[PDB]
Amino acid sequence: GMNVNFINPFLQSLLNVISTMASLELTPGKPQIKTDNLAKGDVSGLIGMVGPQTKGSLSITFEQKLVLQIMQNMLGENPGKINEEVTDLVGEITNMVTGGAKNLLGQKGYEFEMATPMVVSGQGHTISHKANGTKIIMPFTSSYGTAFIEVCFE
Amino acid sequence: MNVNFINPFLQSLLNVISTMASLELTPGKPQIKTDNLAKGDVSGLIGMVGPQTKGSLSITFEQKLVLQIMQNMLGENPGKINEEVTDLVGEITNMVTGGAKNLLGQKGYEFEMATPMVVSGQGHTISHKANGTKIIMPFTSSYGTAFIEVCFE
């Protein structure tokens, strides 16, 4: 029965990357215990986490127009489609979100190590976390479209 | 590291599909991945941390194949990728990684797995970003194709 606040370090870290490094204001929704298969996107960064008394999963999902605007702002270009350069950037965003969360959570005595990012590319795909634990999801909105973070820990 | 860490995962998948001779699945030769051509409709993905290493694994299936796997394993299929199907994909992912964890442990190498995630979406691709060699192996049948990819850094 995990505290919904476990998503906060991930939220803060994503807002750090996107709002400052990408100068793009994402407006977060309210963290929800997941109850829909409705968090569709076009490219997603996925990573596992393993700790002494923990294991889990993080996904960060973006609509195409949003991730392309993020790439424009961060790197000064974008190829107008999801390609390898886009998936590489999503991988790096995933590492920085997870890493910042690791730092913030470590300061609070929660230890984990991240695995390595996998990036999913596909129109309108969804992610389902299969850990036996609480699934916490939150939307983010911009005029460019929507993103979602989902975390799950056993 | 290369054959040493990756082969258990490949053998463990083979083991898990050897249980369904019905499908008549022909494995290909494992190789270094050098394109983004490996598409599927549902995939199981899992991270892992090991001795001086970390990495990732995914198993991607075409819909027609995963539905026949469900027919063989559970005696039914819904004719589409639903929660039942994503659950089974997650479980196969755990068995494949669980088996490999045992084999590597046997050999003296401790790997800790994270928890699985399952992607649903027509014709999606998975790109592993670990800084190390990406190994992919396909397995094909008249019902369709699947791919396992494993990468350690």
List A30's β-bridge partners, or say none: none
What domains can be seen in chain B, in order of their start residue? 2-153 (3.40.1550.10)
Distances (CA, A) of B50 to A30, A55, A132, B33: 35, 14, 22, 22
A-interface mutation test, from B37, B81, B85, B119, most A Cβ less than 10 A away? B119
Other C-beta atoms closer than 10 Å to the C-beta of B2 total 11
Closest chain B C-alpha to A131 CA, distance in angstroms: 5
Nearest to B99 by CA among B153, B18, B2: B18
Experimental method: X-ray
Model resolution, angstroms:
1.9
Closest chain A C-alpha to B123 CA, distance in angstroms: 6
The answer to whether residues B41 and B120 touch, using CB atoms and an 8 Å cutoff, is yes
Nearest to B49 by CA among B134, B117, B113: B113
For residues B32-53, b (16+ Cβ closer than 10 Å) or e, as one string? ebeeeebbbbbbbbbbbbbeeb
A121–B127: do the CB atoms touch at under 8 Å? yes
What would the two tokens of residue A134 be?
Answer: 């609480």
**Chain B residue closest in CA terms to A87:** B127
Residues A139 and A5: their CA atoms lie apart, in Å, by 15
What would the two tokens of residue A113 be?
Answer: 């190590």
Residues A107 and B43: their CA atoms lie apart, in Å, by 34
